[PDB]
């Protein structure tokens, strides 16, 4: 539940971007290999699909499927055993802004995709499979945000609430629990910003993602919350979607008014 849900978080981010992107002409390889299997079986299966795929008559499409099956196969070959229970591969080139595509090939070991074997070559990625790696979840979420609200109903002075403030509190000394909004719209170039970048004339990660990888080096304790609950929506639209319950009052310095200059 602890650092487990933190992973489910990332899976949810992935599935979200896969079904988001679309390619033309059935050329998107999705491949899921359950544990206990041998790689060689699927390897020289794609090999067959390669022969089969060679009857298409759609030069532009055929050629596409060929290079996708190939791109998968010799990626799959890189593994020597279906790693401790699970292997997932999404592959193919997907349309992009500016009209220039970008061949995409993800492969990763999940957390026991029990019995779920699957090959598919559609014009989109099939994430239904992944769905198994995903209100007990909401009650904890609501319970957590309320724990945070108490620090406001009590004025205690343990909490923040704010990007520049929560980051500083984390940066400085300690925060007990970091509350972050799943779909937080924040990029970490250190100066933080949202999608207010088309106007400004300002390594380059998503704050959301950077926290998921470094929070450990700070004491917390990180929880991703969704704006499903009433609490969530509050926590998001009312408190920037990012905050923390500290232990112990700080003075939030660096920096702005007080000034004075």
């Amino acid at each position: 539940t602890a650092e487990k849900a933190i992973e489910i978080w990332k899976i949810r981010r992935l599935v979200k971007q896969l079904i988001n992107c679309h390619g033309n002409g059935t050329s998107m390889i999705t491949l899921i290999i359950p544990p206990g299997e041998q790689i060689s079986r699927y390897s020289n299966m794609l090999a067959e699909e390669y022969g089969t795929a060679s009857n298409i008559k759609s030069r532009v499409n055929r050629l596409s499927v060929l290079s996708a099956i190939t791109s998968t196969r010799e990626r799959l070959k890189l593994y020597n055993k279906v790693p401790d229970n699970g292997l997932v591969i999404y592959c193919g080139e997907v349309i992009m802004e500016g009209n220039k595509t970008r061949k995409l090939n993800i492969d990763f070991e999940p957390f026991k995709p029990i019995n779920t074997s699957q090959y598919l070559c559609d014009n989109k990625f099939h994430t239904e499979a992944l769905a198994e790696l995903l209100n007990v979840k909401y009650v904890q979420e609501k319970k957590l945000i309320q724990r945070f609200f108490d620090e406001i109903s009590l004025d205690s002075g343990k909490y923040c609430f704010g990007v520049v403030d929560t980051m500083n509190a984390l940066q400085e000394g300690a925060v007990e629990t970091l509350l972050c909004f799943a779909d937080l719209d924040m990029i970490r170039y250190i100066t933080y910003m949202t999608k207010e970048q088309e106007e400004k004339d300002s390594s380059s990660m998503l704050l959301s993602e950077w926290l998921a990888e470094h929070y450990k080096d700070y004491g917390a304790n990180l929880e991703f919350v969704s704006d499903r609950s009433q609490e969530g929506m509050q926590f998001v639209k009312g408190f920037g979607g990012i905050g923390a319950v500290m232990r112990y009052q700080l003075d939030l310095s660096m920096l702005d008014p007080e000034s004075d200059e």
């Binding site: 609200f149 406001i152 109903s153 009433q230 929506m233 509050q234 926590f235 639209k237 009312g238």
Partner: protein, 196 residues
């Protein structure tokens, strides 16, 4: 004095029947009413009082059933029949005094819930808390970080879709509303300014 009748019920039956209680103004047989907020125009071709008898016209305070003519596929219970000269106001943003009642934790900007203004019922969320109030209803000059049980406060509220309403100062009924975290009634309040 504009006509105002919040549609409480709507049903078909060889003709549409909108029924409500006239809250202001009057309506005559063969007149044109406006359905707010959708700005649909309808013709009124009959008025029937509680005795099920037709009448030539109803003043306000009357409980009537109206038989209307015209496209109404969009007319829903909660909308308001009004005159095409001074149609009742409708908006998605408004400011309002709010007495917080049973509200089991806190209340801050992101707070969303169900608002029942008149015949209507609608999803509402707080936009901003503007002031707090004490005993002699005073205007705290710092906006409240949050709100709590039994606390007077004045905030800004947003709705997904337009709802007809009026300043409590102008039409008490069109201005009162209660709020429900629809477990229970968390607050009551009155509209103090329609934001366009």
């Amino acid at each position: 004095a504009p006509f105002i009748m919040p549609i409480a019920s709507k049903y078909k039956d060889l003709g549409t029947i909108l029924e409500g209680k006239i809250e202001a103004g009057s309506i005559k047989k063969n007149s044109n009413v406006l359905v707010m907020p959708i700005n649909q125009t309808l013709e009124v071709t009959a008025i029937y009082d509680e005795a099920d008898e037709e009448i030539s016209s109803s003043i306000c305070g009357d409980q009537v059933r109206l038989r209307v003519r015209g496209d109404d596929s969009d007319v829903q219970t909660g909308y308001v029949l009004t005159s095409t000269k001074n149609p009742v106001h409708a908006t998605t943003r408004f400011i309002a005094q709010i007495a917080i009642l049973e509200l089991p934790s806190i209340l801050t900007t992101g707070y969303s819930c169900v608002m029942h203004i008149h015949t209507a019922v609608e999803e509402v969320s707080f936009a901003k808390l503007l002031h707090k109030l004490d005993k002699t209803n005073r205007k705290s000059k710092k906006p409240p970080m949050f709100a709590t049980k039994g606390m007077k406060i004045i905030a800004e509220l947003e709705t997904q879709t337009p709802v007809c309403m009026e300043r409590f100062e102008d039409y008490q009924y069109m201005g009162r509303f209660t709020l429900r975290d629809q477990g229970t009634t968390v607050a009551v309040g009155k509209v103090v300014k329609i934001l366009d």
